Design an enzyme around this catalytic site. Structure first.
Site, PDB file in Angstrom:
ATOM      1  N   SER A  92      48.778  38.254  36.056  1.00 36.64           N
ATOM      2  CA  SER A  92      48.264  38.260  37.426  1.00 36.64           C
ATOM      3  C   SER A  92      47.538  39.563  37.715  1.00 36.64           C
ATOM      4  O   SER A  92      46.688  39.987  36.936  1.00 36.64           O
ATOM      5  CB  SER A  92      49.409  38.084  38.428  1.00 36.64           C
ATOM      6  OG  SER A  92      50.134  36.905  38.200  1.00 36.64           O
ATOM      7  N   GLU A 117      42.729  32.648  33.871  1.00 35.10           N
ATOM      8  CA  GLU A 117      43.587  31.847  34.734  1.00 35.10           C
ATOM      9  C   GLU A 117      43.533  32.389  36.153  1.00 35.10           C
ATOM     10  O   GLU A 117      43.277  33.575  36.365  1.00 35.10           O
ATOM     11  CB  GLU A 117      45.030  31.795  34.202  1.00 35.10           C
ATOM     12  CG  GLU A 117      45.797  33.123  34.207  1.00 35.10           C
ATOM     13  CD  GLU A 117      46.585  33.368  35.491  1.00 35.10           C
ATOM     14  OE1 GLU A 117      46.978  32.395  36.176  1.00 35.10           O
ATOM     15  OE2 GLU A 117      46.826  34.549  35.815  1.00 35.10           O
ATOM     16  N   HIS A 137      50.255  31.310  35.998  1.00 33.15           N
ATOM     17  CA  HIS A 137      51.285  31.403  37.035  1.00 33.15           C
ATOM     18  C   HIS A 137      52.243  30.212  37.043  1.00 33.15           C
ATOM     19  O   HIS A 137      53.242  30.234  37.761  1.00 33.15           O
ATOM     20  CB  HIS A 137      50.648  31.530  38.418  1.00 33.15           C
ATOM     21  CG  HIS A 137      49.994  32.849  38.682  1.00 33.15           C
ATOM     22  ND1 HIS A 137      48.877  33.281  37.998  1.00 33.15           N
ATOM     23  CD2 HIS A 137      50.267  33.809  39.598  1.00 33.15           C
ATOM     24  CE1 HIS A 137      48.503  34.458  38.467  1.00 33.15           C
ATOM     25  NE2 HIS A 137      49.327  34.799  39.441  1.00 33.15           N
TER      26      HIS A 137
END
Ligand code: DSZ
Ligand code: DSZ
Lengths: 335, 335
Positions: free
Chosen positions: B112, B237, B305
């Protein structure tokens, strides 16, 4: 620089939807904006995606590029104005007709997500474009604030290009999220005294560059991001962001050595900034990020998502007088 | 490339909070994650900002850099693991002790927002860092999914560096926003069959580069963004984004000529993607943006995630077999 012809009352303004389909989703405010400018004497040409929806956008990437290009091709249009921003203007950039823009320079105006187009067009053509009103949010605004927005718009775009132009500070402003698409009003927006601040001393003069900072991330590193140069005044504004996002965007600039180049920074008023309970303003976050770098800052310039909105040419010299608390355009920006 | 020493059962893992202060705001999940790794036999060193809050973050920019650096200085630590992401790790990059990282290579792991550190450290040092579990979201996850995450973590980091490693596809996955920070689950998460798709044919082998795409915008254009080169495999992502944001980020890559360079794209499963009623998936948006450019895509890799999460070394060669529907690490990534 490449300069467009000045606007005149009675001219034809074309509008386009390069992202959010607000001519549909904010139809009442759209009609208010159309009627406002028509009452001023302007003729309006609707872009081909007016009244269309593709869920989150007005249409396909290529269709949006075509909508814009067709307004460039129209010989009667003197001003090409965004209807509203969104998220997706940067998609259009490989498909815009930059050669046609060079061949027939026009006033291109908008803000927010439309920054991708304003900056991209400047990068490719050297055309002086304008950070300023979009038809729906800016001109669909109710009086009295819309009148101050219009006064700046008309003054900047119609004035004779003789001597410097010094901005007049709006007496009051608002960022209240009411009276958007409702047909009538229950009350006027809460009005705040102008808290614009000049942090620094002396006078700084340099080419202004920037726009919506969050939007700039969508073109960053590419041939469509204009190079920031030694001496530039960085103009940046954001809307409805968390303090976390603001720190992220300021640090992005730091990592890119932007703060080693700029002579000054202009922060536009941040619409409904979320400080996460810290009571910190964007300027304080910038100060931490700057890590001691003494860059003068004009904090709270009325060229952002707040009302009223001033019109600002991008890519020309401005002079900020920090001692006398004023800001001026010092370079010719229309033919 | 620069390689860290491999992990082993009984090793010491240090954790840091480079952004959101989740050791406080998600303390129950934090305690579960700590207990999980301790029961596996790991010794844990708490970063100096554990249990602290500065509203939206764990501490000042410099405090957070200090927290990370102090883990690098600790000779007992084999693995430095993120507690959680957020928005603000890119701020740390000017202040990390890269010389100490080079002198004392360790396994650096997270995902992230922590992408900023993973990519930044790689850019400065050539160290192979890892896209993988963060203590709180990944190891504080309730069974059954946490066990699959752990199996990948321990396999990738402890296995002998001999021959290629081919990933096992998780049988089921979830992205539901429930069971976050309490002792007990509200109810079991929906378990989806793995719908990972291999769009293309043949075998593509190349250095993998990327991480969280939205986070990459915070380091983009800087010396901390690793250069993408011809033949690379792009790994990207995102989480909880609107389709509008996904189009913006895909077009950013397009403008930056990324799709002229890369030989394949890996899309991590997008947690709770918001299609705005369009029913479109990220791959469809990518296809429009690609504008006829034929690039094979692994759509829905379980390194994102979503739960469970696989561990992926960044900056080493992978091989994607589009015919046989598998993905392998083909280059040594630990000592
Ligand atoms: N339902 C509503 N109610 C009240 N106000 C509304 C509204 N819908 C829109 N507005 C207002 O309309 C204005 C213009 O929105 S915008 O799409 O142009 N914004 C951008 O492109 C950048 N923020 C993207 C970026 O941050 O990158 C904003 O001030 C909103 O508050
Ligand atoms: N209250 C809550 N309830 C349920 N889940 C939660 C939660 N709080 C966090 N999570 C979950 O915790 C995970 C990790 O969050 S994160 O802060 O590390 N995310 C990032 O840094 C990038 N997305 C930033 C970027 O997009 O740039 C996410 O999958 C969340 O769903």
């Amino acid at each position: 620089p490449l300069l467009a012809a000045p606007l005149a009352v009675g001219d034809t303004i074309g509008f386009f939807s390069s992202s959010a389909p607000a001519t549909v989703t904010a139809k009442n405010r759209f009609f208010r904006g159309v009627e406002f400018l028509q009452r001023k004497g302007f003729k309006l040409v609707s872009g081909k995606l007016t009244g269309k929806t593709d869920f989150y956008r007005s249409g396909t990437i290529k269709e949006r590029a075509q909508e814009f290009n067709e307004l460039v091709y129209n010989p009667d249009i003197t001003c090409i104005m965004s209807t509203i921003g969104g998220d997706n203007s940067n998609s259009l950039l490989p498909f815009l007709d930059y050669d046609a823009i060079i061949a027939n320079p026009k006033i291109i105006i908008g803000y927010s997500d439309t920054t991708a187009l304003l900056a991209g067009i400047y990068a490719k053509t050297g055309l002086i474009t304008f950070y300023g009103p979009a038809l729906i949010p800016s001109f669909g605004e109710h009086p009295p604030l819309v009148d101050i927005t219009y006064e700046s718009f008309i003054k900047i775009l119609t004035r004779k290009q003789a001597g410097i132009y010094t901005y007049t500070l709006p007496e009051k402003w608002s960022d209240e999220s009411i009276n958007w698409n409702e047909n009538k009003i229950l009350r006027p927006k809460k009005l705040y005294k102008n808290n614009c601040a000049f942090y620094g001393s002396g006078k700084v003069e340099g080419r202004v560059i920037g726009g919506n900072l969050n939007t700039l991330t969508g073109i960053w590193g590419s041939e469509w991001m204009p190079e920031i140069r030694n001496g530039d005044i960085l103009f940046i504004e954001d809307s409805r962001k968390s303090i976390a996002t603001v720190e992220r965007l300021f640090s992005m600039l730091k990592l890119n050595r932007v703060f080693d180049k700029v002579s000054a920074i202009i922060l536009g008023k941040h619409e409904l900034f979320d400080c996460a309970g810290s009571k910190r303003r964007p300027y304080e976050v910038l100060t931490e990020v700057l890590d001691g770098k003494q860059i003068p800052v004009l904090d709270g310039f009325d060229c952002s998502h707040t009302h009223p909105m001033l019109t600002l040419p991008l890519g020309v010299k401005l002079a900020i007088d920090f001692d006398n608390k004023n800001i001026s355009i010092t370079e010719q920006y229309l033919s």
